Structures are given as C-alpha cells and as structure tokens.
C-alpha cells in the first residue's frame, strides 16, 4: 500500500508566542522584531520550519545515542523521520510539517481583543552605569489556537517502523509542551500545548486503534 497519515493537532499557546521575522529596518518607534504573519490575512503563522527544525534540535538530545555534531549526523531513527542530506535512503524524510495560520479568529474577536499580536515592551539594564535600552517586540496573544498538522507517509519502505517512530514524535510533542518552540524562549515565550493529536489515515489500509491508544 501507500499510507499517508495526517496528524491533526491543536497548538494552543500559553505565555504567548513570538517567532522572528523581518529584521529589515522597520520604523522608528514601531516594533523592532516583528512576528512573521501570513500576507493574505496578517494573522500570526507558525511555519513548519520552526516546528521541524526545533523538534530536530530537541530530539537530538533524546534519540541520538551518540552526540551529534550537526543534523547530518543524526541516527537512523531520526534520519528517516526528519530527513537527511548525506544518508543514502533517508533523503525525502517522510514528515511534511504543515503550518498553522491562527485558525480561530471568530472566537478571538468574540472575546474583546483589539489585535491578535500584542506589542510587549522590554529593555535592558547594564550592570555597570545602569543605562536603559528599550524595545517593543511583537508576540501572538495568549489563548490562541493553531490548527497544526503533520503528514507521515508510509510507502511500504519501512514495514517495521509503525510504532518505532510514534513513540519518538509523541514524546517530541511532549517536549514541545514543555520546551518553548520559537523565539526568545528562555525569557518565557512560545510554550505551545498540543491538544487533540488526531491521526487519520488519509491514504492507506491502516487503523489508528493501535496509534491513539499511545497518542492519547
């Protein structure tokens, strides 16, 4: 068979997220580090490169039994899952991390929210001379959702990695429920929460009855 499987999920923000964007020289008093927004709707967009590369750099610590000097040196548990540039059979690596374009806006404007991107203020104080240095950085608002989805494709090339990859990706989702996923994380941004990890086999003879009993 050929089994493409779609992982419907709800990225709900808490401690609202900022992904970087155009640090091309913006206006004077305006936002210094603006968020990347989808140019049709101007809602915040969490692109798939942040998700895939962040889950790459976080599953580095989990499933690379050896220390990895670079993402080419990922093991053959992650090279088949996130792609690899120098491996023989692990190019085109089976996971299309689709984006999310701020799914709810009829809900988030039903709550009395002016704009979906707050402009939180920040500065820095040097320890010597204590000079201030202010900045206005853009973030998405707190209780947003994000209709995020994966595409895992099973081409009968594996035939044994049915659940050898979902214990990896589900615990990566747990990592992202703990770690920040995007932007100035160590100041406490991002903090996505993954809700309703709904897998559905959009192509293939396959059941989720052995899948969502682990993915909860």
């Amino acid at each position: 068979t050929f089994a493409k499987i779609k992982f419907s999920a709800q990225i709900r923000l808490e401690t609202g997220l900022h992904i970087g964007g155009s640090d091309a020289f913006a206006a004077i008093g305006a936002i210094n580090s603006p968020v990347i927004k989808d140019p049709i709707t101007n809602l915040p967009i969490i692109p798939g490169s942040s998700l895939k590369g962040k889950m790459r750099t976080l599953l580095a610590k989990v499933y690379n039994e050896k220390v990895a000097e670079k993402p080419s040196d990922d093991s053959d548990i992650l090279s088949r899952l996130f792609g690899n540039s120098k491996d023989k059979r692990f190019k085109m690596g089976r996971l299309i991390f689709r984006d999310a374009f701020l799914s709810n806006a009829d809900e988030l404007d039903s709550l009395g929210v002016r704009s979906y991107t707050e402009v939180k203020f920040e500065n820095t104080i040097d320890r010597i001379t204590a000079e201030a240095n202010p900045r206005q950085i853009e973030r998405a608002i707190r209780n947003s959702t994000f209709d995020f989805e994966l595409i895992y494709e099973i081409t009968d090339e594996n035939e044994n990695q049915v659940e050898e990859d979902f214990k990896v990706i589900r615990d990566g989702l747990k990592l992202l429920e703990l770690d920040y996923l995007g932007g100035s994380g160590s100041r406490g941004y991002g903090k996505v929460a993954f809700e309703n990890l709904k897998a559905t086999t959009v192509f293939g003879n396959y059941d989720v009855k052995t899948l969502n009993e682990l993915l909860t």
Partner: protein, 733 residues
C-alpha cells in the same frame, strides 16, 4: 626556391646596420655598415650585395640584380617614402591627448610591461650593447636555411620591437623596426612572386628608371581568413561536464593553433613564410600576398581542401572564409581612400564566401545519407570515430581534446601526421615538453611564451595561460589565514570595447587619413596580442587565479575573488598605462559558490559582461547587473577611498560589528526619501552610544557617510553599498 630565401634574408636584414650605427655612432649611412656586420657574422655574398646596394646611389654600383627588387621592397613597406626614441602607437590613436614615447628595452619572459610616457624621451645608447651585441651573440654563426627560417623571425620581435625607424623626422614617427622588417620581407616576397610568375628578368629598368609603372600597378593582394564558429567551438562546453578549465583552455588554444596553422599552411603552399602573415588573432587573420593565378587558384585549392578537412571532422562547426583585395602601391600619403575602400573589398569577399557556403559536390556528399547512428558524441553532437573515454561515448576530436588538455602544460607543440588533434590535411598537433623535442618527428613546432629560440627551431606563438592552484580550490584559497574572507570564486570576462571599431576605423579618426595605414594597425594588433597573450601571466603572477582564455578582445579568468578583483584592478590600471586611457575595457565579475558548474557560470558572466558593455562605452558589472559603475569611478572611489575608510573604521573599534554594516547595506539598498531620515536617526542614535574615547571617529564617519548617502546623485550611493559588500565579504567568518 633557393634564390627566394636569399632575397628574403637580404631585404629583411635592411636597417640592421641602423642598430649598429645607433650603437656606436658610426659614419654616413646604415647601408654600408650593415653589410660589414653581415660580412663579419657569416658568409653569404648574395645577401651581402643585397644589403650593400639597396639605396638609390648604391644600386647603380651593383650592375639584372636582386637589389633593384630590394629598393622597391622597402619604400612601399614604409608608410612614407639618429637619437630619437620609439613613439607610441597610441600617440596616433584617439584624439589630441597626452603624447607618450617608448623606452628602449628588450623583451623578456614575465619581466617587462614597458608603458610609454614622456619620462623616456631621453635616449639610451648603452642598451644597444645589451641588444645589438646580443644579436651578435645569438646570430653569430647563423646558418641560412629553412629549418631556421623560423627563429630569426622570432629574434626581431625580441630585439627590435621597441626600436623605431626614421629618427630625424617631424610627422611620421612611430614605426617599430621589427614589424617594419616583417613588412619589408613580405613586400620583397610579393615583388618576387609577381615578377617571377610573369617571368621578368631585367629589374634594372621596369623597377628603377620607371618606378611609377609598378608603383601604380595593382599587383598585390591583401588576403585574410575569418574563421567562423569560433565562439561556438569554444562554448561547446555545457553544464555537468568534466573539463572546467582543461576543456576550455584546450579548445580555445586549439582554435588559436588552428588559426596559426591556416597561416602556416597557406604560406608554405606558396613560396612565402611568417613575414607575409601580418596579424593572426581570434580567428581573423590578415596577410600580404602577391597577385597572380598561382597565388589565387592555390588559395581556393587549399580553401576547398581545408574546408573538406573541417567538414570531415566537424561537419560545418567551423568554416574558413578567405578574401583578397587587389591593390597597388597606393597606401602611401589618397592614403585615406586607398586603404578603406579596398580593405573592405576582401571583407565584402569574406561576406560573399561566408553566405554562399559550399558547392554541389560537397553538400551532395554531405546529405547523401548512408549512416546508421545510435550513439552521439554529445559534446559536439557528432558521430564520427566514436570511442568510450571514461565510460562515456565521445568522438576522436573530443578525446584528443582531453589529451591536449593534459599536454597543454608543456611548452612546445609539434605537428605530426597521426599523433594528436588534427589541425589540417595530414597534419595533426601534439604538445611536447622541451627535452622530448628533437626525438619525435615533426615539420612545424610552436612554443608558447618564449623569446629565445629553443630546441627544434619553433615559431614563437603567444597565449597567456595560468594555473596558480587548480580550479577546484580557488574556493578554498579565498579565505585568509585567519579565516576572514568568504569561500567564493569570481569569474571575470573582460572585453575590449569595440575592438572591431578600434581596428577598422581606429587611427583614421585622427588626421586627414595620414595615419590610416596598415603598419599602425598591424603594430596595434600585435600590441594587443603582446598584452592579452603574454603579459596577463605577469599580472596574474602572485595572485591566485586561472586565466582560462585570454586574447584578442576577451579575457575569461576564473579564480578567487580578492585576487580576481585585484587582478582586474591591476589589469586596467596598467592597461590605461599601456593604452594611454584609450580603449577602456569592460569587465564583468560574478561571484559563484563552491562547485557550481561553469557553463552555468560562463553564461551569467557573459550576461553581466554585456550589461556592463551597454552601460556606456565601458563599465564594470560586479556581482549583479544593478552594480554597474565606470571603472574610473570603481577603483578610485570604492577600492581606494571608501573601502579603506570602511576597513580602518571597523578595524580600529570593536562595538560596531557586522549587524551595523548589514543595516547600512539595507538602508543603502531600499532608499526611498524616508530612509534618509531613518539613516539620519540611525547614525545620530549610534553617535551618542559609542564610548567617549573613540567617539569622534564615529562622528567624523557619520559626517563622512551622510555626505554620500544623501548626495542626490546615485553615483556615490551604490558605490558605498558595494564597498560595504566588499568589506563584509572580506571579513566573513
């Protein structure tokens, strides 16, 4: 014939006693003392009386003689009928400008770039001992034969290329003596063939006491051959191909040797030799031949034979186009209208032959069918003589090209009958080192970039090639030892701006047609040959690059980008010293990443090259067609003024690193009216943010930066953006 060589040597060694009487300051004329020099070196009495009795008062002391030829061989070879230096060829090019004079030195390998000026108007009397006695060394015991017909035609190009003639003059003052001797021997061969094909014997009356009869007789041919398919044969390389520079060097050197051998097969098929061929360049080559049926029918015979050769191994991927203008002794000041209307006659014959390509038997043999073909030599799409070089199916010419690319690094090139790439009918060409020379069999050997003779008595061709490192590590040789610099490789394709117009019209802009002669054009094209085919190995000497192709009006030089930019800087800043600022060159330099293919890269380099061409008369195009400056604006403002201020400003401080440079580049690139206000905010906000010690450096730099940023010209803005791009690429970690 045997007497033909004697006439050639006797007319060619004219004014050799001028070098001697310039060396020692001797008596009445060069005419008597040159024959004394010839009597002192060796023994040939016919050549001796030829040098004895060439003058008007001297030829009566001879007698028929070989000297009544030798007089009229000289005066038509001269454009007109002491202690001065050689005037500039570019003194008669252009308009009334800075007048320069040459400096008398010999030629040496990768040593001298003798730029003319006014500081060499004083005269050198001691260097003749380094020249004339030098000849008295190397031409001490010179046997007068055809095997050494070659190296003596080398020798004047080594020795008398910077030595003038007619020192005590006022108007016509820039003829070098070596090319004058080449033209004099060519005219002697022309007179000898025209007078020995008509069977005339007594030259004492029809040449001497009635000089006007032959002097107004259309008895000369200005022949040419334009090669066709040259750039298509060079750029037959495609993307994803083995030979990056090996293939391209081999192809555009093999075409150069083909354009040399078309001459060297045209001349010995007649009685002629290298003195009759005036200029060989990028396929185009111009001659002086005689006018008879034994000239013309043999020309058309070898035209059809060589066309059968090119059709046999190429199938119309190359085409020789002959053409011969019939002309009298008219090109002596009528001199405006004497050159131009009949030099174009051979050019209109070139256009006539290049468009009525072949005859019925050849094309009837061409599309006669009779071939079952499955495999192709996908280099040239051909089928003939297919072999299986390195598990790919290529032809024999496209395998001898790989042998030629392996043997180009040698210094000599013999012509065999079955070894190497074919350059003519039963004439193949194979490279060879110096010590392997006298063992193998040959009939003509070339040497690349020499001035002394060598071993097998070679013809001294000139083709500037270089390999500092190989082509695959000009990426790795781009960073400095610190790691500062970006792993790039830049490709420059120069082009001389309208060398067709500088060749065809050129000097004819000046004067009333007084300088619209052939000798100045041959000397100018030999000067372009001597720069673009020898001297580029001097400007590329310490710098790390590879001159893939050079010559004529094109230089394709790949290499590392700092050395490529500095090599273009030094090439034009010594070209405008070489060419007095006239003939500005229009280079195009593109950055390309590591291991990107070259026919993908040569196409973009050519696109930037033609966008730099159409800018004005000249421009550099750097890293993209929107960075298009005059060279007079590029090296002076960016690479001398702005880049050093930018480098010193960021070296002698450590707050403003690369983020500030990136934001300055972006404000230089977007640049609406409001971005000048944003930059006036940016520099002033950083002005009070730097530390108090090195603060006024920032204050004078923002004062000096807002000068060119808001300069309202856009001639001082993209310059600064490119200066910052060059600095960022120089400090890349």
């Amino acid at each position: 014939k045997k007497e033909k060589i004697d006439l050639f040597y006797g007319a060619l060694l004219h004014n050799i006693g001028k070098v001697i009487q310039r060396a020692t300051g001797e008596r009445k004329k060069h005419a008597l003392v040159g024959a004394d020099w010839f009597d002192e070196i060796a023994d040939n009495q016919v050549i001796s009386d030829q040098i004895r009795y060439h003058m008007a008062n001297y030829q009566s002391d001879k007698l028929d003689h070989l000297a009544y030829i030798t007089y009229i061989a000289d005066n038509i070879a001269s454009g007109v009928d002491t202690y001065t230096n050689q005037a500039d060829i570019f003194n008669v090019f252009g308009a009334q400008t800075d007048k320069r004079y040459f400096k008398p030195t010999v030629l040496n390998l990768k040593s001298k770039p003798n730029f003319a000026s006014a500081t060499y108007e004083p005269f050198s009397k001691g260097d003749y001992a380094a020249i004339a006695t030098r000849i008295k060394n190397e031409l001490a015991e010179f046997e007068f034969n055809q095997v050494q017909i070659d190296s003596l035609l080398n020798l004047f190009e080594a020795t008398l290329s910077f030595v003038p003639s007619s020192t005590n003059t006022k108007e016509i003052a820039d003829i070098s003596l070596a090319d004058h001797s080449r033209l004099t021997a060519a005219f002697a061969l022309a007179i000898y063939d025209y007078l020995e094909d008509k069977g005339r014997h007594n030259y004492k009356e029809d040449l001497f006491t009635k000089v006007s009869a032959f002097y107004e007789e259309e008895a000369f041919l200005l022949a040419s051959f334009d090669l066709s398919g040259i750039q298509d044969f060079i750029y037959n390389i495609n993307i994803a191909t083995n030979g990056a520079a090996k293939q391209l060097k081999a192809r555009s050197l093999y075409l150069d040797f083909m354009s040399e051998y078309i001459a060297d097969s045209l001349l010995d098929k007649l009685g002629l030799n290298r003195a009759n061929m005036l200029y060989v360049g990028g396929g185009h080559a111009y001659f002086v031949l005689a006018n008879t049926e034994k000239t013309v029918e043999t020309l058309v015979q070898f035209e059809k034979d060589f066309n059968q050769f090119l059709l046999a191994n190429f199938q119309t991927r190359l085409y020789v186009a002959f053409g011969w203008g019939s002309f009298a002794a008219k090109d002596i000041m009528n001199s405006p209208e004497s050159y131009r209307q009949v030099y174009q006659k051979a050019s209109r014959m070139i256009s006539k032959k290049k468009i009525s390509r072949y005859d019925y038997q050849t094309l009837m043999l061409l599309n006669r069918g009779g071939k079952s073909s499955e495999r192709e030599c996908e280099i040239c799409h051909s089928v003939e003589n297919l072999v299986s070089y390195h598990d790919q199916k290529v032809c024999d010419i496209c395998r001898g090209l790989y042998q030629f690319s392996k043997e180009i690094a040698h210094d000599h090139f013999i012509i065999t009958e079955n070894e190497g790439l074919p350059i003519g009918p039963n004439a193949c060409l194979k490279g060879v080192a110096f010590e392997k020379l006298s063992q193998e069999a040959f009939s003509r050997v070339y040497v690349k970039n020499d001035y002394k003779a060598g071993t097998v008595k070679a013809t001294h061709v000139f083709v500037g090639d270089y390999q500092c490192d190989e082509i695959y590590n000009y990426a790795a040789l781009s960073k400095n030892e610190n790691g500062l610099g970006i792993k790039r490789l830049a490709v420059v394709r120069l082009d001389v701006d309208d060398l067709g117009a500088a060749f065809m019209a050129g000097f004819s802009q000046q004067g009333n047609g007084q300088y619209s002669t052939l000798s100045r054009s041959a000397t100018f094209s030999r000067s372009m040959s001597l720069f673009f085919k020898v001297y580029i190995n001097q400007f590329a000497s310490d710098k790390k690059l590879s001159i893939i192709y050079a010559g004529g009006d094109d230089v394709f030089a790949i290499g590392s980008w700092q050395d490529i930019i500095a090599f273009t800087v030094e090439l034009r800043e010594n070209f405008i010293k070489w060419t007095n600022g006239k003939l500005t060159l229009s280079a195009g330099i593109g950055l390309f990443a590591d291991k990107t293919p070259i026919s993908l890269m040569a196409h973009q380099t050519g696109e930037l090259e033609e966008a730099a061409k159409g800018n004005e008369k000249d421009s550099i195009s750097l890293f993209s067609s929107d960075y298009t400056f005059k060279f007079d604006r590029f090296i002076t403002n960016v690479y001398d003024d702005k880049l050093e201020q930018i480098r010193y400003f960021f070296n002698h401080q450590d707050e403003r690193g690369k983020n500030f440079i990136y934001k300055l580049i972006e404000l230089l690139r977007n640049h609406d009216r409001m971005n000048m206000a944003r930059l006036a905010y940016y520099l002033t906000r950083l002005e009070e943010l730097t530390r108090e010690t090195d603060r006024d450096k920032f204050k004078t730099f923002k004062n000096l930066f807002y000068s060119w940023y808001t300069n309202k010209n856009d001639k001082d803005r993209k310059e600064a953006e490119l200066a910052l791009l060059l600095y960022i690429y120089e400090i890349r970690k």
